[PDB]
UniProtKB/Swiss-Prot annotation, chain A:
Family: Belongs to the universal ribosomal protein uL2 family.
Subcellular location per the Swiss-Prot or TrEMBL entry: Cytoplasm
Protein name in UniProt: Large ribosomal subunit protein uL2A
Main subcellular location: cytoplasm
Organism: Saccharomyces cerevisiae (strain ATCC 204508 / S288c)
Modification type Phosphoserine: residues: 33, 76, 140-141
An example Gene Ontology CC term for this record: cytosolic large ribosomal subunit
Lineage: Eukaryota, Fungi, Dikarya, Ascomycota, Saccharomycotina
UniProtKB/Swiss-Prot annotation, chain B:
GO process annotations (BP): cytoplasmic translation; ribosomal large subunit assembly
Family: Belongs to the universal ribosomal protein uL23 family.
GO cellular component: cytosol; cytosolic large ribosomal subunit; preribosome, large subunit precursor
Keyword field: Cytoplasm, Isopeptide bond, Ribonucleoprotein, Ribosomal protein, RNA-binding, rRNA-binding, Ubl conjugation
Protein name: Large ribosomal subunit protein uL23
Subcellular compartments: Cytoplasm
Full-protein residues shown: 72 to 142 of 142
Recorded GO MF terms: RNA binding; rRNA binding; structural constituent of ribosome
Protein function: Component of the ribosome, a large ribonucleoprotein complex responsible for the synthesis of proteins in the cell. The small ribosomal subunit (SSU) binds messenger RNAs (mRNAs) and translates the encoded message by selecting cognate aminoacyl-transfer RNA (tRNA) molecules. The large subunit (LSU) contains the ribosomal catalytic site termed the peptidyl transferase center (PTC), which catalyzes the formation of peptide bonds, thereby polymerizing the amino acids delivered by tRNAs into a polypeptide chain.
Signal peptide: none
Organism: Saccharomyces cerevisiae (strain ATCC 204508 / S288c)
Keyword RNA-binding: yes
From Swiss-Prot, chain F:
Organism the protein comes from: Saccharomyces cerevisiae (strain ATCC 204508 / S288c)
Keyword Ligase: no
InterPro entries: Ribosomal_eL37/eL43, Ribosomal_eL43, Ribosomal_protein_eL43, Ribosomal_zn-bd
GO molecular function: structural constituent of ribosome; zinc ion binding
Any one GO CC term of the record: cytosolic large ribosomal subunit
More details: Present with 44600 molecules/cell in log phase SD medium.
Gene: RPL43A
Protein name: Large ribosomal subunit protein eL43A
HAMAP family per record: Ribosomal_eL43
From Swiss-Prot, chain G:
This protein's encoding gene: RPL19A
Species per Swiss-Prot/TrEMBL record: Saccharomyces cerevisiae (strain ATCC 204508 / S288c)
Region (Disordered): 1-22
Entry protein name: Large ribosomal subunit protein eL19A
Residues of the full protein shown: 64 to 155 of 189
Compartments, record wording: Cytoplasm
Family: Belongs to the eukaryotic ribosomal protein eL19 family.
Leftover remarks: Present with 97700 molecules/cell in log phase SD medium.
Length: 180, 71, 77, 112, 50, 91, 92
RNA sequence: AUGGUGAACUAUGCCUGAAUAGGGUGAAGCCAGAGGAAACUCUGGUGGAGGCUCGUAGCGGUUCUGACGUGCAAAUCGAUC
RNA sequence: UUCAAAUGAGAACUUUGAAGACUGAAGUGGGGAAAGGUUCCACGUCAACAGCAGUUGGACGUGGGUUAGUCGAUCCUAAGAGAUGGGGAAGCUCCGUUUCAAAGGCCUGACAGGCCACCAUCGAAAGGGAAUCCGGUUAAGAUUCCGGAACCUGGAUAUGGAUUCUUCACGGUAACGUAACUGAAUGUGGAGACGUCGGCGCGAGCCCUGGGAGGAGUUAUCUUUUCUUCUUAACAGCUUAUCACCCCGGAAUUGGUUUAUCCGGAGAUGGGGUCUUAUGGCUGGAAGAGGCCAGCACCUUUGCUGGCUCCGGUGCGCUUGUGACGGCCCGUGAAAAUCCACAGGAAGGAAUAGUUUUCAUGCCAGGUCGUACUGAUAACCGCAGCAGGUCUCCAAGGUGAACAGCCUCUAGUUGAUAGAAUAAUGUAGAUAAGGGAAGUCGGCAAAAUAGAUCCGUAACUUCGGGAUAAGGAUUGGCUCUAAGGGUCGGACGAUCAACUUAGAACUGGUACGGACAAGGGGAAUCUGACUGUCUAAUUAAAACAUAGCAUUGCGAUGGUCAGAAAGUGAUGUUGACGCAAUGUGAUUUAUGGAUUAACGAGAUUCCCACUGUCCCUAUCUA
RNA sequence: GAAGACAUUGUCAGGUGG
């Protein structure tokens, strides 16, 4: 974990996110140290104090540098952006989604993985979504999720064909290699 | 020390380890009534200290050596 | 050290109250096919930086040696 | 062939403890301890090298005067001379489009 | 080593000034047994372990 | 010249590691190292690196993509259904 | 010095006194780059003279990267016959 | 059994630094020519990849059951791999 | 290893001097790290120690000696350990490192108002980092001292200069420039800050060397010859370059360009220009110093004087540094202290006078500690002065592919107990007719080809290889020919210089990679897929891992796993293309079945030549 | 915000159980 730039986290559920939206901007797109997926240095304007607040989102596919993100609850449905899951209909594919609102993401984070909203419980707000494993699960709407798949799908298809590549792989995350 | 004297207008002195360049530069100036240019210091292996003191252009070394008593 | 091209610049560095001491050097060199000429080098102890002046003519040297003040301590070579 | 001794006590061929050789007046080679290289300063927007500036060590910038670490125009010692040009006209055009949205919103509230 | 700490120098001084044999004038005192300096030292023979 | 019949681009590895594996790694190796079309420039100067990334030197822009391609069929279909669903939900 | 001078004369170079390969003695890459970085600049100093036009200089760039050009004298013969077929095509 | 001491030899993960000729073969992509209606395909070069290969220093100790073994050595020597 | 002299009583051994050898620059050289700690140097001296002796010595006695604003530590933070808060623990003390904390300091401004947000601290003499060179000097040290010459930081404060009555400069289209040319709080950006390998350019050092001036040496005979010297720092001033950048103008008859093929209407080629200033050049520095010579003095304190100290060339040369590119990966190859700038503009200030101390000059100061020495077949660790081991820089010439081996110059050893004798046998190294593995469990060991070029190299295959396959020829010296180039001129010519290949002769032991160095090959069977890892100190595989294949579990109050207990703890800065345990191990087709190219210090049979394995033993060398 | 008299924590009693 020498080179790990930062946890692939979300913004916090502040007043802007909760009663509106905010425009936040990407500055670069960088490869994580020992991760199947890339990340994104992405910056906002802290609305309580005069400075540009950095954030570290996970890099869904399709997103390029020099891009904006309107985001919060009143954000238009577009790739890269984020919403709490109540405003969207069923079928909107998302990723990096939260278990509880403001936990900054547990589910649907790994490379080329996603989740699929299929249902709503709008009264007594929840939202129905399938996992990559496929286990159905219904969660509150106020928690959030980023649009689109994690970039890098098809990392798994390539074989490795020699042991040194696996040693270079598993030097980075954890010494769980060579295995008996 | 004799060679350093008759080459540099320089002196040698055996010193208490707790001191430094400033105290030495003051003390010889106080007792022996001479200005200095600079000081350099080492720690002899025996635990003692020793300091090499360059007097200025405008004084001499052998007269003051006879004044203090050693040669 | 530094070099000089203007003598009207030069002639106050020798009066600037930092200098106590200066010197002259002479050099034996040959120009393109030329003839072997002595070459004067007037050097002056600016304390932060040594200032020099290279001169080939000897009449100018005799001029400047007399133009300079009497109190200033010069040496030769 | 004369052979040369490191002058500093680090024997190793580190990034820093580097060796250029230079011949001397007295007729014996010695080693000479070069120090690390500069780098071009860069563009906060472009990621590009920017001109006019002296590539100097970071504290070594404190000795030189204002000119060598600077150029004249605004955004002098940080920017590309094209990234400035881009952002300025961005700030002008969207400043005009603020007036565009002004006329739109005053039109619709006049309709209301 | 020669990037040695002051205290290393300070114990070296004690060894260097211990390592002298007996001054001869003690040999003639009244009722003396101390003939050879037995806590004497050399440098290749015995380490000091600092 | 086309210097071989079927081994093609992965011939540096040699006779090792099996033909059924050499075929798949070849299929992905041609895809990763080629140069791809910039969305903005329209130029074949877009190169990956540090897998997941895709980078046009012309106009300096960078984009995430597949591990070994600029974009996936899943990227295509989610793009298309988003083009649908944005227009559907907005109005 | 005498041994060297005989080597300059081109002696002590038979098969008997060779223990290393052609590559280690004279690499193909240095030979290629010497001949080609002579050829390119020859083409350039003909181009600035206008002895050959830009289009033919361009196509001869690729043809000179390719073989069918062995060395300087051979390509100059190609230059002369190129002038000949040039005047042929523009005349006829 | 109780209470303590030990990772300077050695096993393992980190972190920061450093070191490793001269050669053999000749991968992609590219250049030229040729063939072909095309798709594509053959030749001559280019390029210098490959947990390829020889070989040194480097690592290691296969073997001889060799020198030596009351040894230089409480594990060395040389030759071999 | 040898000979003479001195010393002393005494010399196989000390010292000097004459010869002989060696390490032969990936050293028996010169410096360093860890460790050692007076071993470093002198004088005196041998009863011990130096497995002999000793007048010598790392031994013994007495003393001498380690000089810093600039090398380094200290400062930074790294993985990491670790206080206080707090909570547990019967308790020694533990979990945790910014968190269930009233943690700390300012900024005007009349004791009242207002802003800011961290959290300790420790950890690199090899990472980051402010700044120094030369010459001389000692018995012994120097980027430390002396002589000379520069630089950095932090201060005060005068002057010069600039800006100003238009107060916070002007110029240039622009790139950007000059001697400066205010500015806080806060914000943003940059450096520090960053991989491996390949090829290409550039320059530095070294190597080859032309001419000239000096000194030495060979000269029976030849050689306008052979060897050595001819150098120039820090730092400052001026100047200079690729990538890139600006103005012009608009490209198809598509062009430009690298070794390597990429670029262009998002504006090429081309013309002109800006910057980076590593590097390069000129000057100062700096000839006064250093060096190479001569002539003088003289027990001389030991000195004095003269001259010369110049101008060129080439290279795939060796090493090293940097640059522009390219590849390389499910590996993308660190953070902080510190410094600077930018936006921002609180506010301050001149006209009879101020402002600028990021320009130039000028003044004082820079503390503590280490610093010697060896760094090893005697200075350390191995119970020792042990044929062992310990990280690293410099790295010449011939040879030749070379950093193999052989020889040599610079430099340094000439240490290893010696002497007289040649009987066997041993140990290492060699040769032997004739036959050629018959011997022997066993081609164990010895020996055979081995280098470079021309032709040529089967089956089988996972088509990639096997392949230095096999196998045949050739290999010396001397004198020639052809081809392979730059720089200067408008079809070609003048000048300048390199070793690469090919081709034809003449010649002698008919031997010529002549030494040294240096693959024996092949026909069948089985096993593991391979590179790889180990039972050090009786086993280096058919054992282990390996990428793959398939299955199973887990959706965070979760899975695995841990703690004395906790307000605990890893995986986790993670989230099903994931985390974890499984059988099994490439390919064709799961105690796993038939198959399989390459490879293995894997195991077995046989063919070639090879030879003392043998008939049968003999000789020689240290 | 979630959760809420259940959880949980302190203490007791069944099945299983190298
Ligand atoms: Zn682009």
């Amino acid at each position: 974990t020498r080179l790990r730039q930062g946890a692939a986290k979300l913004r916090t559920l502040d007043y802007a996110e909760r009663h509106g939206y905010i425009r936040g901007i990407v500055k670069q797109i960088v490869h994580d140290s020992g991760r199947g997926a890339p990340l994104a240095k992405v910056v906002f304007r802290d609305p309580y104090k005069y400075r540009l607040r950095e954030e570290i989102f996970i890099a869904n596919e399709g997103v390029h540098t020099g891009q904006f993100i309107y985001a919060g609850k009143k954000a238009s449905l577009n790739v890269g952006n984020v919403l709490p899951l109540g405003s969207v209909p069923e079928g909107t594919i998302v990723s990096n989604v939260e278990e509880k609102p403001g936990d900054r993401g547990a589910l649907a984070r790994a490379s080329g993985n996603y989740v699929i909203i299929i249902g709503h419980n709008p009264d007594e707000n929840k939202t129905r979504v399938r996992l990559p494993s496929g286990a159905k699960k219904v969660i509150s709407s106020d928690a959030r999720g980023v649009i689109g798949v994690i970039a890098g799908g098809g990392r798994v298809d390539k074989p490795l064909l020699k042991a040194g590549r696996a040693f270079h792989k598993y030097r980075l995350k954890r010494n769980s290699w060579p295995k008996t | 020390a004799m060679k350093k004297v008759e080459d540099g207008n320089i002196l040698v002195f055996q010193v208490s380890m707790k001191a430094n360049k400033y105290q030495i530069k003051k003390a010889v100036k106080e007792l022996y009534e001479v200005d200095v240019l600079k000081v350099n210091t080492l720690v002899r292996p025996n635990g003692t200290k020793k300091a090499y003191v360059r007097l200025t252009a405008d004084y001499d070394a052998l007269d003051i050596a006879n004044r203090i008593g050693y040669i | 050290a530094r070099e000089i091209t203007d003598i009207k610049q030069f002639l106050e560095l020798t009066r600037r109250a930092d200098v106590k001491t200066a010197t002259v050097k002479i050099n034996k060199k040959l120009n393109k096919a030329g003839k072997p000429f002595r070459q004067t080098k007037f050097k002056v102890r600016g304390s932060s930086s040594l200032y020099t002046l290279v001169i080939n003519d000897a009449g100018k040297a005799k001029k400047l040696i007399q133009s300079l003040p009497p109190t200033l301590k010069v040496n030769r070579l | 062939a004369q052979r040369v001794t490191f002058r500093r006590r680090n024997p190793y061929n580190t990034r820093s403890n580097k060796i250029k050789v230079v011949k001397t007046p007295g007729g014996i080679l010695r080693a000479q301890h070069v120090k690390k290289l500069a780098t071009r300063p860069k563009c906060g927007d472009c990621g590009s090298a920017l001109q006019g500036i002296s590539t100097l060590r970071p504290r070594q910038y404190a000795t030189v005067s204002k000119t060598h670490k600077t150029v004249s125009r605004a955004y002098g010692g940080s920017r590309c001379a094209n990234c400035v040009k881009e952002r300025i006209i961005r700030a002008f055009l969207i400043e005009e489009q603020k007036i565009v949205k002004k006329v739109v919103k005053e039109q619709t509230e006049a309709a209301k | 080593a020669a990037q040695k700490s002051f205290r290393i120098k300070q114990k070296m001084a004690k060894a260097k000034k211990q390592n002298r044999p007996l001054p001869q004038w003690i040999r003639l005192r009244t009722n003396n047994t101390i003939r050879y300096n037995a806590k004497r030292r050399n440098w290749r023979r015995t380490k000091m372990n600092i | 010249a086309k210097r071989t019949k079927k081994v093609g681009i992965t011939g540096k590895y040699g006779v090792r590691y099996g033909s059924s594996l050499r075929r798949q790694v070849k299929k992905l190796e041609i895809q990763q190292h080629a140069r791809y079309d910039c969305s903005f420039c329209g130029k074949k100067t877009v190169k990956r690196g540090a897998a997941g990334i895709w980078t046009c030197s012309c106009c300096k822009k960078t984009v995430a993509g597949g591990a070994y391609t600029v974009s996936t069929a899943a990227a295509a279909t989610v793009r298309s259904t988003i083009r649908r669903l944005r227009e559907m939900v907005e109005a | 010095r005498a041994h060297a001078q005989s080597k300059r004369e081109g002696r002590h170079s038979g098969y008997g006194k060779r223990k290393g390969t052609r590559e280690a003695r004279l690499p193909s890459q240095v030979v290629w780059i010497r001949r080609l970085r002579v050829l390119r600049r020859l083409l350039a100093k003909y181009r600035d003279a206008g002895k050959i036009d830009k289009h033919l200089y361009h196509v001869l760039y690729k043809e000179s990267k390719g073989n069918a050009f062995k060395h300087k004298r051979a390509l100059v013969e190609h230059i002369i016959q190129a002038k000949a077929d040039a005047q042929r095509e523009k005349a006829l």
